[PDB]
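Page 37, continued from 36.
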């Protein structure tokens, strides 16, 4: 369906999203935006999971960037920076990943756990890397029934971590030292991303292409994965993201898939490695 964006007016084609489906997503999300005692990360997080269920053939990144985002900044009451999309969207992505994958991962004993700003010291210490990375480095922790280090009472040990970045245009090179230190300790360092990147009018056409280019085109971002192997693996939910070729110099790959469903390349990856 066609979206009308006011900057000057511009349009963007939202493939595999019907007028009916947009409204169903909007009827779900809007009342949650200004709901008291309901954190923005939970409102946006659950909405993303719901939206991908409603439109399983639509580009998940487009649902994030062109639907949820533009509805939020339109419906959000107040300029409170602690409730900003910018301040909360990242943690909403973490919430979305946990909600989406843990039911599938539960069977194999694999457990995800979102880490929010200020409360990841326990996670990082148990991970044994807080020593060298600081208190603001890992977004989602990966634990495993049985194996791992610093197991809780239920026998869940830390086996790795996830850097959840909505856009790779972010300070992505900032997470690379921590990721290297993680991988060196025998921990999985996954880069989960929505690969959000569109350019606004007057010069951009607002198509969410991302920042990973193509394997035929030298991209510094892509070269982190396929060149230097600074992350264990890279998972994008922007359907426009060019996946890695069969072989890469580092042996690391950029996997691309939709967000809806049961098992995918992400769960199948975590199962094998763990």
């Amino acid at each position: 369906m066609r979206l009308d964006l006011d900057f000057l007016v511009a349009h963007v084609m939202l493939d595999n999203v019907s007028e009916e489906q947009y409204q169903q997503i909007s009827d779900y999300f809007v009342p949650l935006v200004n709901k008291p005692k309901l954190k923005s990360r939970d409102a946006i997080g659950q909405a993303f999971v719901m939206a991908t269920e409603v439109c399983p053939d639509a580009n998940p990144s487009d649902l994030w960037h062109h639907v949820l985002y533009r509805i939020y900044i339109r419906e959000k009451i107040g300029t409170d920076p602690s409730q900003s999309w910018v301040r909360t969207s990242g943690e909403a992505f973490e919430v979305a990943l946990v909600e989406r994958y843990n039911p599938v991962l539960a069977r194999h004993g694999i457990r995800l756990t979102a880490l929010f700003k200020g409360q990841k010291g326990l996670a990082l210490t148990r991970m044994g890397v807080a020593d060298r990375v600081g208190s603001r480095k890992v977004d989602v922790m990966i634990e495993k029934q049985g194996g791992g280090r610093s197991p809780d009472a239920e026998g869940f040990g830390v086996v790795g971590g996830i850097h959840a970045k909505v856009s790779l245009a972010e300070r992505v090179s900032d997470d690379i030292p921590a990721s290297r230190i993680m991988m060196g300790e025998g921990l999985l360092s996954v880069l989960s991303t929505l690969d959000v990147k569109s350019f606004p009018p007057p010069h951009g056409d607002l198509v969410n292409r991302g920042e990973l280019g193509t394997p035929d085109r030298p991209s510094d971002k892509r070269n982190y994965i396929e060149g230097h192997g600074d992350f264990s693996a890279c998972f994008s939910y922007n359907l426009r993201t060019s996946p890695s070729n069969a072989t890469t110099p580092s042996g690391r790959h950029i996997y691309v898939s939709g967000f809806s469903g049961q098992d995918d390349e992400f769960t199948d990856y975590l199962v094998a490695q763990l």
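The chain is about 40% helix and 15% strand. Flag for discussion at group meeting. Residues 1-274 form one domain.
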